[PDB]
Structure formats: C-alpha cells, structure tokens
A paper describes a structure:
Several sets of host cell machinery facilitate this process, including proteins of the endosomal sorting complexes required for transport pathway, which mediates the membrane fission reaction required to complete viral budding, as well as angiomotin (AMOT) and NEDD4L, which bind one another and promote virion membrane envelopment.
The cryptic peptide binds in the opposite orientation of AMOT PPxY peptides and is therefore not discussed further. All five of our new structures exhibit canonical WW domains, with three-stranded β-sheets and canonical positioning of the two eponymous Trp residues.
Numbering used by the authors: 494 to 532
C-alpha cells in the first residue's frame, strides 16, 4: 500500500486526450515525461 511520490512541488494530472501529464510548480512548467522514470 506504499505510494510512489513525485518530487516536491510536482503533481500528476490526466489531460483530456487521456495522457498523464506532470506539473512542476517549482519552475511553473509542464511535461509529458514522468520524473519517476528519471530517478
């Protein structure tokens, strides 16, 4: 039941076209690439 965390200031949403996307509030930017693939 352990959750997988994004780094601080990041959140995931689902776009209307069905793709997940990621908001980086630290830089006020968005990306299709999940940071967790990049740890």
């Amino acid at each position: 039941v352990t959750q997988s965390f994004l780094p601080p200031g990041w959140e995931m949403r689902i776009a209307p076209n069905g793709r997940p996307f990621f908001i980086d509030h630290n830089t006020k930017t968005t990306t299709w690439e999940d940071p967790r693939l990049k740890f």
